[PDB]
Structures are given as structure tokens and as C-alpha cells.
């Protein structure tokens, strides 16, 4: 290309960090790159196949602005947000559910579980503010799943159910970040 350089030259996207038969997730961070580093903003690319589900997870600290570049997206965003419900129950929790058409935006704030299904082949642009040291914690599947990391007698008290039972149920998910959709 341009046999002249050094500056903020363009950048695009190299090895996906999650990928399989249902989707890929590309991600560049303030860490791994020069121009974002100052912005402290990160970016990502979502590429999933119709009927595929990106299991629930959350990002420790970055707030992710998600632009639907193409296809249809079903979205499940939960959270409590307002402690202005200062006495426990008051700020009961929410399920913000919506399908995003091409053009739409949805914001994902740091600690909220989120999951999305591609109701049709999907390409999403994601811009995450406060991106330094952000870790994604998965709540289902076989990889990066945080639950599964809970000690047998821990689960025992955390859940209705038993330790044997909880390892059980969690080992029942073979895939990892993206996953076949189908209901009932």
C-alpha cells in the first residue's frame, strides 16, 4: 500500500478471538493498539449465522455501543440500574427485550447480562467506551464460563439443586460462545 508511514495509519481486524460454526467475534483493545489506547475505546466485529445464539455474558467494565450493520437481532438485556430504590427489592430487575433492525443501536452497560440471537445472518459493529482491562464473563457454554468455576458446596447453597446436579447441567453445554438456536 503506502510506502510512507507512521502515524495513525488505518487498521482493520486480524485473528477472531471466538469463532465456530455459528459465529466469530473479532476484538481490538486499547492494550493491543496505538490509536484506541488514547481513546480508551475498544472495537469489535460480530459475525453470526441465522439462528445462532451468543450465550449470556457480561463485560466487566466497558460500556459497549452495538450498531446493527446488517440482519436482524434479537436482544436480551437485563439489569437493575437505579439504587434510587435504596431498600433492596425496590430496584427490582429488568428485562429489556428487543429486536434490532438494520440501522438500530442498543447500548450495553458494563455489568448487565446480555444475550443475542441472529434472527437472520448478522453483522454487528461494536464500540466500547472505558475499554481498558475489560474481561467478558460467560454464564453458559463450556469456555470462559464463570459459574462452572464455583466450588461444589458453593453451588450447593447458591442454587436450588445439588453440586453433582450443577456440574451436571453446566457440562450439558458443549459449545462455547455462539450456539445453535432452537426452542420449545
Amino acid at each position: 500500500t503506502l510506502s510512507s508511514q507512521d502515524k495513525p495509519f488505518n487498521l482493520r481486524s486480524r485473528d477472531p478471538i471466538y469463532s465456530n460454526n455459528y459465529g466469530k467475534l473479532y476484538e481490538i483493545t486499547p492494550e493491543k493498539n496505538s490509536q484506541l489506547r488514547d481513546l480508551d475505546i475498544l472495537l469489535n466485529c460480530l459475525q453470526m449465522n441465522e439462528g445462532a445464539l451468543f450465550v449470556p455474558h457480561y463485560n466487566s467494565r466497558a460500556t459497549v455501543i452495538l450498531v446493527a450493520n446488517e440482519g436482524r437481532a434479537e436482544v436480551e438485556l437485563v439489569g437493575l440500574e437505579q439504587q434510587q430504590q435504596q431498600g433492596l427489592e425496590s430496584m427490582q430487575l429488568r428485562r429489556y427485550a428487543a429486536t434490532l433492525s438494520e440501522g438500530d443501536i442498543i447500548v450495553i452497560p458494563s455489568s448487565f447480562p446480555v444475550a443475542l440471537k441472529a434472527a437472520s445472518d448478522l453483522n454487528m459493529v461494536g464500540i466500547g467506551v472505558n475499554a481498558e482491562n475489560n474481561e467478558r464473563n460467560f454464564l453458559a457454554g463450556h469456555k470462559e464460563n464463570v459459574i462452572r468455576q464455583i466450588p461444589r458446596q458453593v453451588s450447593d447453597l447458591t442454587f436450588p439443586g445439588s453440586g453433582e446436579e450443577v456440574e451436571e447441567l453446566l457440562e450439558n453445554q458443549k459449545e462455547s460462545y455462539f450456539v445453535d438456536g432452537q426452542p420449545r
Binding site: L53, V55, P56, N59, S60, R61, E76, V78, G79, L80, E81, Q83, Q86, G87, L88, E89, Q92, L93, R94, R95, A97, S110, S111, P113, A115, K117, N130, N133, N134, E135, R136, N137, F138, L139, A140, G141, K143, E144, N145, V146, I147, Q149, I150, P151, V154, L157, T158, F159, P160, G161, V166, L169, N172, Q173, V179, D180, G181, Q182, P183, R184
Partner: protein, 181 residues
């Protein structure tokens, strides 16, 4: 309880939880009754008193917390996408929990209470602090139940009813749980 005149003496919290084995308080907002404490705006102070042979169920906070044990002793366990770290804190030990990290607490085999001050530093919602609980109780329930049937039924590859009964608790002793033994 109403608004104010010029002060920095703050003695009253709000209980977010109070049961058999302990309390959960949260000092009110600093700039709340004064423009004088504007600078203290992004931080919150909570108070945590637990009893011997008790567990705080596994959860995570939207903010980073700076936990200082003022009385007694505890077992701190932090969960990671691939692991766990356990820490023993005896009185006067302090340690920061990166936000997003899920952790539980425990006051050991004892005869005394654990007393903990959590210094929360807020980033998404200024001056606001949210804890996400894996479990269901009577107050709020498990954040996993906010998902629609199919979602969960797919992420897990098990049927609804089998999630439910390893979803939906009857945690009588809500947030705090006497470690049976």
C-alpha cells in the same frame, strides 16, 4: 429525614438487606444533601456485618470495591473465567476487587462477627452501586431468570424444567446463609 445545611458528619445508612446472619447497609450519597461534597460524588461506602459460620452468596458488583476488614476474619474467594483465588483476611487487611469479578464471603468456624467496610468506586452510573446475584431469594431473584425460556434452553441445551430446578431458589435465608457446617 429531609435535606440540609453545610455538613460532613454522616452517621446513617440504608439497609439493603437484614436477616439471621447479618446486615447490609449503604451510606447515603455524599453530594446528596450538599453541593459541598461534590468531589466525593463517584464513590459509595457500604457496611458489612456477618456472623460466625455464614456465607454471602456468589455475586458481582458494577463497581470496583475496596474491602477493609475492621473486625474479625474472613475467607475471600474470587472467581475467574478459568479459576479461583482464595484469600484469608484477618483484621486490618485490605484488598481491591476489580469490578465484574464475582466473589463470595465467609466468616470462619468462629465465635465472632466479621465486620467489613466496602469502599465502592463508581464508573457507569455515577455515585451508583449495583450487585448482581446468581441466586433467588425473597427480595429480588436470580438474574438468570430474566432470560426467556428458549434463550436459556439454548445456551444450556437442557429443557426448561431442568433449568428452573437449578435456576429458581427458595433461599429462605436470602443473602446470608449459616454455613450448615
Amino acid at each position: 429525614a429531609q435535606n440540609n445545611p453545610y455538613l460532613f458528619r454522616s452517621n446513617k445508612f440504608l439497609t439493603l438487606f437484614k436477616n439471621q446472619h447479618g446486615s447490609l447497609r449503604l451510606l447515603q450519597r455524599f453530594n446528596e444533601d450538599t453541593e459541598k461534597l461534590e468531589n466525593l460524588r463517584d464513590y459509595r461506602v457500604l457496611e458489612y456485618c456477618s456472623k460466625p459460620n455464614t456465607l454471602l452468596l456468589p455475586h458481582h458488583s458494577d463497581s470496583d470495591l475496596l474491602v477493609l476488614v475492621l473486625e474479625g476474619q474472613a475467607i475471600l474467594v474470587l472467581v475467574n473465567p478459568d479459576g479461583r483465588d482464595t484469600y484469608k483476611l484477618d483484621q486490618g487487611d485490605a484488598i481491591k476487587i476489580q469490578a465484574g469479578t464475582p466473589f463470595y464471603l465467609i466468616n470462619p468456624d468462629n465465635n465472632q462477627n466479621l465486620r467489613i467496610l466496602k469502599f465502592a468506586i463508581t464508573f457507569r452510573r455515577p455515585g451508583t452501586v449495583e450487585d448482581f446475584f446468581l441466586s433467588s431469594t425473597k427480595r429480588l431473584p436470580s438474574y438468570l431468570s430474566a432470560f426467556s425460556k428458549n434463550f436459556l434452553e439454548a445456551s444450556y441445551d437442557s429443557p426448561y424444567d431442568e433449568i428452573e430446578q437449578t435456576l429458581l431458589q427458595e433461599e429462605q435465608e436470602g443473602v446470608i446463609v449459616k454455613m450448615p457446617k
